[PDB]
Design a protein around this ligand. Structure first.
Ligand SMILES: [Ca+2]
Ligand SMILES: [Ca+2]
Ligand SMILES: [Ca+2]
Lengths: 150, 10
């Protein structure tokens, strides 16, 4: 009910370089009255509970199906790649009032299901960008799961 | 607080 997001993951082991390309979102929830949504994507690199790095896409105006093709790279040393989370949040930009979250997902070793599958496919295919769709989840539910270590 | 970086440029 919140929408779907597609992004690719690439890890370059010898470089300790993690690249997330936000490709496209679709079926996004409508978050404006007298408009659609104005989605941008924020990416947080976290280590369980702690914020490490953040990046964000441009804003696409008045659409529930944004296309980005924007690449985001993070330094994650080989020894640390199974300790981090890449958190992807889609938000509706508003000039007036809160920028409300449409939904979010995270990938990493402590993710589950299709999110863990994507992460494992990345690690299993070093230097190759692996693209996968993800269902967006309620922000507060994903936030709770960020604390669950494996 | 840090200004949020945008997409890769290279
Ligand atoms: Ca809004
Ligand atoms: Ca940062
Ligand atoms: Ca808006």
């Amino acid at each position: 009910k919140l929408g779907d997001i597609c992004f690719s993951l690439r890890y370059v082991p010898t470089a300790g370089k993690l690249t997330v390309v936000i490709l496209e979102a679709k079926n996004l929830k409508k978050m404006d009255v007298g408009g659609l949504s104005d989605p941008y994507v924020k990416i947080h690199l976290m280590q369980n509970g702690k914020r490490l790095k953040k990046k964000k896409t441009t804003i696409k105006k008045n659409t529930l199906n944004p296309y980005y093709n924007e690449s985001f790279s993070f330094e994650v040393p080989f020894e640390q790649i199974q300790k981090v989370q890449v958190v992807v949040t889609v938000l509706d930009y508003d000039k007036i009032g809160k920028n409300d979250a449409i939904g979010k997902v995270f990938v990493g070793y402590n993710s589950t299901g299709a999110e863990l599958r994507h992460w494992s496919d990345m690690l299993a295919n070093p230097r190759r960008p692996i693209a996968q769709w993800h269902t967006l989840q309620v922000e507060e539910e994903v936030d709770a799961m960020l604390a669950v270590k494996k | 607080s840090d200004a949020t970086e945008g997409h890769d440029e290279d």
